Amino acid sequence: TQVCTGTDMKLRLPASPETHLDMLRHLYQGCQVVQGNLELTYLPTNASLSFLQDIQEVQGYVLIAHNQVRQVPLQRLRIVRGTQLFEDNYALAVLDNGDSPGGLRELQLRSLTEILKGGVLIQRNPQLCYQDTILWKDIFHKNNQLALTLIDTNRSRACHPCSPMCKGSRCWGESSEDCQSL
């Protein structure tokens, strides 16, 4: 498969919106396996992110933070290995996305079935729905001994229920294609 190298920018503000998006597009276009951390930060509402759509594996951690963009197209992401972790604890960190209102509306991690190491931190995403419905224990791998969670569900909009097609009312978004594969 096509591999790319990840970043280690964490929450630092980029030097320029243009050079930032250009760097991410050139890094991840066509990429399937990120050998490193997938950090997606400070992206504005009009950001074109189709270049992420082939990512299937992240070897480090995924950080989605300080974005106004309403969707992040990671529907093909199947595994986060967590060989590096955000704050040495979290394999998936979704932070401060927000503030039509800006801000991530759904995670839409339809293919995510395994986190091998590290936990899940979801904080201060005022338009984010459904993150409380996910059974994270079905995603943490059996040898993941940092399977800790903090899922902030405070939000500023009312969420429509998971699709009635979804078993156990667990979903990554409103669509019947967004049910959690359990």
């Epitope: 604890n89 936990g119 943490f140 059996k142 001994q145 800790l148 903090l150």
Partner: antibody
Framework: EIQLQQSGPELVKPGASVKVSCKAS????????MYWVKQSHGKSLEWIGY????????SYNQKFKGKATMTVDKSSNTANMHLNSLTSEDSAVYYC?????????????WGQGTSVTVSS | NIVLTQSPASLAVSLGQRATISCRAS??????????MHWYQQKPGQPPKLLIF???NLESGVPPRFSGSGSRTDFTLTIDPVEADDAATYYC?????????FGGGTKLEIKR
């Protein structure tokens, strides 16, 4: 040197709640997870859960879900464990212990234990 | 849940002899080239103290009379030579899964 200083022994009535505190010093408190562990008298050690002080992520033993709640107070470098709805079977020594990532998540520094007596 | 079974539950060893304590796990505690097995000493009325981490690593400050060996489902703590200060209960503990579990403990009586 690293020290974990726990609050003193507690006498609590059945049905009440108790707060056990664990004050950390000698290292960066928010850089390490904190384990909580139960030991009934003459029995083995049981894992209750662990917490990340920096962002508050937690992992609980299912056996203690809803008996124990872990929190931190960063300003005082303190981890706290609240035990609720107490029964005779909750009378035990409760320990906090630091998680060491490099040492395979071993419990490398322990508090001195807080003895809780549940009784009328 | 990985169940840890320590053997023997108690033993009496004289000063200068070797003490051997075994920890048998119900399934492998190995992953990513690590054995996630640790050993602790608990004297009566005290907290446990870490002796050995990751099956064979001696914790800094612990006397080299203590050693750990083993892999997969079978681990051993050796104390050689036994000294009076070793009177204590010894526990193994694993974290190859998020659910941490401990052995039932082995009580070491010093034979004088």
């Amino acid at each position: 040197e690293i020290q974990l200083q726990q609050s003193g022994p507690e006498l609590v009535k059945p049905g009440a709640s108790v707060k056990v505190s664990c004050k950390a010093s000698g290292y960066a408190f928010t850089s390490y997870n904190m384990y909580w562990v139960k030991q009934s008298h003459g029995k083995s050690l049981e894992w209750i859960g662990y917490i990340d002080p920096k962002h508050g992520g937690t992992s609980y033993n299912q056996k203690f879900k809803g008996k124990a709640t872990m929190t931190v107070d960063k300003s005082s470098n303190t981890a706290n464990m609240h035990l609720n709805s107490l029964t005779s079977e909750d009378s035990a020594v409760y320990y906090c212990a630091r998680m060491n990532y490099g040492s395979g998540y071993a419990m490398d520094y322990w508090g001195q234990g807080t003895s809780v007596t549940v009784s009328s | 849940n990985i169940v840890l079974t320590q053997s023997p539950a108690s033993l009496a060893v004289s000063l200068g002899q070797r003490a051997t304590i075994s920890c048998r796990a119900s399934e492998s505690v190995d992953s990513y080239g690590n054995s996630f097995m640790h050993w602790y000493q608990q004297k009566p009325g005290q907290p446990p103290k870490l002796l050995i981490f990751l099956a064979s690593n001696l914790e800094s400050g612990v006397p080299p009379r203590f050693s750990g060996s083993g892999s997969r489902t079978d681990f051993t703590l050796t104390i050689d030579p036994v000294e009076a200060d070793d009177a204590a209960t010894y526990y193994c503990q694993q974290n190859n899964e998020d659910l941490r579990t401990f052995g039932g403990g082995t009580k070491l009586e010093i034979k004088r």
